[PDB]
């Protein structure tokens, strides 16, 4: 009782080609639905939609959720490295439970132990992908309370099916510690960098090619016209030029004017936006496959659920308007991948004839063909890290459309409840995780310099990243990753 | 201390008139001047930017090509001459003197950032009409 | 660099006028320099600099610059202080200044 199971471990080392961050945080968790396994549905929340209708179970157990960079970087850290190198990646988990207390309703309870297990079998359902609240605190001298765990299964609207599921050794401990080391599957590097040179740039500006295009279709005014003519693809015609790689897929989102005068007066905000439909419930695309934001110079215009999009610290829950929170833009993609609020491309829709004229149409989605490159959405210090992929017989480009590392072996659930004895009470804690990670240094001989990120050196009322006069930490704005430039 | 301006008329739509300012009391050669031009009901819109010498010039997006600036030192004029008015034109058009600069800039002193006009002219309306 | 279409505010009291602003206007740390017109005669410079007022200009006007957005408040409205005031600031992307959407004063009396 009067031994100390652990101290307060909090830093980073900067190490070769990896980067050690140790978190610390301080945790409170109450009991979760008296001890009970609930069912839940739409029903109780009356399911006045179908494409809201939800079936499942809400559990007693909390969970512990670092999966959000703001946990493992202070705002300095993420400076320090989104600065200086083209990619990193995480390598080793080290996770660790001390200092337990518990409560009863206020004193010591001192004979109550608290049930703690990690899945690494992967057997509960995974709801960490989802970023979700309830993350560790990104400001370290903030005490935060712990989620609840609950998951949801098939049903068919309100009502379950004989199909679903329903749902370990627990060590249990307050003089105990508990500990755990989590291993990686090797993932590629993120690419925190954006490309010097656009996928239709790529050709030397000086030569001409020895492919051939055809110029003229006839020869002039008139009837009876017809002639083909030919040109050599070079400098004069740039977009013409034959081409190895083009970009990546496209499914085209409804753009939206940030100024409003502009954007149309009709509600088009749901019926507008795009979606997908699973089992005849139409769900939003959201983000979707990574696409530029906007076309060139024009910032003002985003895609309708295509970006993610984060509230500014104390922004209310709903109807909040354009300045309470913070959007994200892709424009760095804008080099190999196409907008969102852009068509692909157009094609032919008929065969000509000297009856007919050619046809074209326009692509409003295109899957994947062959020689297409792109790259993936970025991650932000407030953007999760990793997610699970789901267990399927094939999957393409298992990266998860938010952003971050598709695995499929995440880091494991790591479940906590207080043992029942009922008694009203809650237990605290002490969290120490630990995540070791790799870098991809810079080799770049660029000239002309970078990029990089900053602080405005002006006179402010606050500084950012800092605490107001109340105390209450501030994230002002989304920091993306990709500053540093590469070729492509 | 004084800028007039003078030139203005009527031009009817897509002919070119130059349109001239005289400054005297004060030295020519030491401050940057700019053209800012108001229509009636709408907020000031600048025109253009010609440094000391006139060795940079950087025009606003609108009229770019269409209009060109002239200083001559040496009589204490500023000249802007514009070409292919449409009536989209049609407003005052004042001679400006920059001199303030935003702060951090100023060691750098570049011909543009000298957006601060301590004094400017009379204006002169330039109305393009059929 | 966006004004308010119009401010009202009586005499012997506190009024305030602001212009938001982008990053390539007022995020770069440029001075915003604020201009006032009587109706149908010429500009002057009021505010030279980010709150400065020159030699010849009256103490109640003052304006301060935060953020992106730059505010100006003139204390003790006078009846001469009726007119147009302008916003400027230079715009990076643009590579030229750009000068607010205009606003007019109101005293109320």
């Known amino acids: 009782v009067g031994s100390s199971s652990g101290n307060w471990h909090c830093d980073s080392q900067w190490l070769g080609d990896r980067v050690i961050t140790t978190s610390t945080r301080t945790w409170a968790l109450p009991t979760y639905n008296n001890h009970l396994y609930k069912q839940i549905s739409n029903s109780t929340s009356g399911g006045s939609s179908n494409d809201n209708a939800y079936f499942g179970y809400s559990t007693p157990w909390g969970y512990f959720d670092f999966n959000r960079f703001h946990c493992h970087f202070s705002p300095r850290d993420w400076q320090r490295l989104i600065n200086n190198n083209w990619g990193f990646r995480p390598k080793r988990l080290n996770f660790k439970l001390f200092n337990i207390q518990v409560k009863e309703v206020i004193a010591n309870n001192l004979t109550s132990t608290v049930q703690v297990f990690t899945d690494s079998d992967y057997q509960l359902p995974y709801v960490l992908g989802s970023a979700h609240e309830g993350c560790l605190p990104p400001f370290p001298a903030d005490v935060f309370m712990i989620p609840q765990y609950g998951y949801l299964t098939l049903n068919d609207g309100s009502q379950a099916v004989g199909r679903s599921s329903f749902y370990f050794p627990s060590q249990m401990l307050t003089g105990n510690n508990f500990q755990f080391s989590y291993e990686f599957e090797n993932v590629p590097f993120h690419s925190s960098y954006a490309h010097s040179q656009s996928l239709d740039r790529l050709m030397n500006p000086l030569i001409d090619q020895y492919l051939y295009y055809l110029s003229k279709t006839i020869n002039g005014s008139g009837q009876n016209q017809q002639t083909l003519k030919f040109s050599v693809a070079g400098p004069s015609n740039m977009a013409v030029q034959g081409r190895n790689y083009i970009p990546g897929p496209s499914y085209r989102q409804q753009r939206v004017s940030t100024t409003v005068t502009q954007n149309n007066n009709s509600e088009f905000a749901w019926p507008g936006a795009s979606s997908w439909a699973l089992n005849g419930r139409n769900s939003l695309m959201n983000p979707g496959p990574a696409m530029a934001s906007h076309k060139e110079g024009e910032d003002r215009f985003f895609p309708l659920s295509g970006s993610l999009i984060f509230g500014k610290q104390g922004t209310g829950r709903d109807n909040v308007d354009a300045d309470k929170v913070m959007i994200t833009n892709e424009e760095e993609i804008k080099t190999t991948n196409p907008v969102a609020t852009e068509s692909y491309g157009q094609v032919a829709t008929n065969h000509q004839s000297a009856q007919a004229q050619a046809q074209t149409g326009w692509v409003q989605n295109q899957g994947i063909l062959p020689g297409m490159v792109w790259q993936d959405r970025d991650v932000y210090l407030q953007g999760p890290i990793w997610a699970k992929i789901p267990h399927t017989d094939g999957n393409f480009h298992p990266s998860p459309l938010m952003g971050g590392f598709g695995m499929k072996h995440p880091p494991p659930q790591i479940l906590i409840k207080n043992t029942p004895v009922f008694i009203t009470q809650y237990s605290t804690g002490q969290v120490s995780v630990e995540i070791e990670w790799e870098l991809q240094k810079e080799n770049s001989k660029r000239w002309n310099p970078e990029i990089q990120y900053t602080s405005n050196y002006y006179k402010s009322n606050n500084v950012e990243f800092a605490v107001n006069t109340e105390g209450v930490y501030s994230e002002p704005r989304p920091i993306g990753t990709r500053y540093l430039t590469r070729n492509l | 201390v004084q800028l007039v301006e003078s030139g203005g008329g009527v031009v009817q739509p897509g002919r070119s008139l130059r349109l001239s300012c005289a400054a005297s009391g004060f030295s020519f050669s030491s401050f940057v001047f700019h053209w800012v031009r108001q229509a009636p009901g709408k907020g000031l819109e600048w025109v253009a930017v010609i440094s000391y010498d006139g060795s940079n010039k950087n025009y606003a997006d609108s009229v770019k090509g269409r209009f060109t600036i002239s200083r001559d030192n040496s009589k204490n004029t500023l000249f802007l001459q514009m070409n292919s008015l449409s009536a989209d034109d049609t407003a005052v058009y004042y001679c400006?003197?920059?001199?303030?600069?935003?702060?951090?800039?100023?060691?750098?002193?570049?011909?543009?950032?000298?957006?601060?006009?301590?004094?400017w002219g009379q204006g002169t309306t330039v109305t393009v009409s059929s | 660099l966006t004004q308010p279409p119009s401010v009202s505010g009586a005499p012997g009291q506190r009024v305030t006028i602001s212009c938001t602003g982008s990053r390539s206007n007022i995020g770069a740390g440029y001075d915003v320099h604020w201009y006032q017109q009587l109706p149908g005669t010429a500009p002057k410079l009021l505010i030279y600099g980010n709150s400065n007022r020159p030699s010849g200009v009256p103490d109640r006007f003052s304006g301060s610059k935060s953020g992106t957005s730059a505010s100006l408040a003139i204390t003790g409205l006078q009846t001469d202080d009726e007119a147009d005031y302008y916003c400027?600031?230079?715009?990076?992307?643009?590579?030229?200044?750009?000068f607010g959407g205009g606003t007019k004063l109101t005293v109320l009396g």
């Open positions: 400006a003197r920059g001199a303030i600069c935003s702060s951090t800039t100023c060691y750098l002193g570049d011909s543009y950032y000298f957006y601060g006009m301590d004094v």
């Open positions: 400027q600031s230079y715009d990076s992307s643009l590579s030229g200044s750009v």
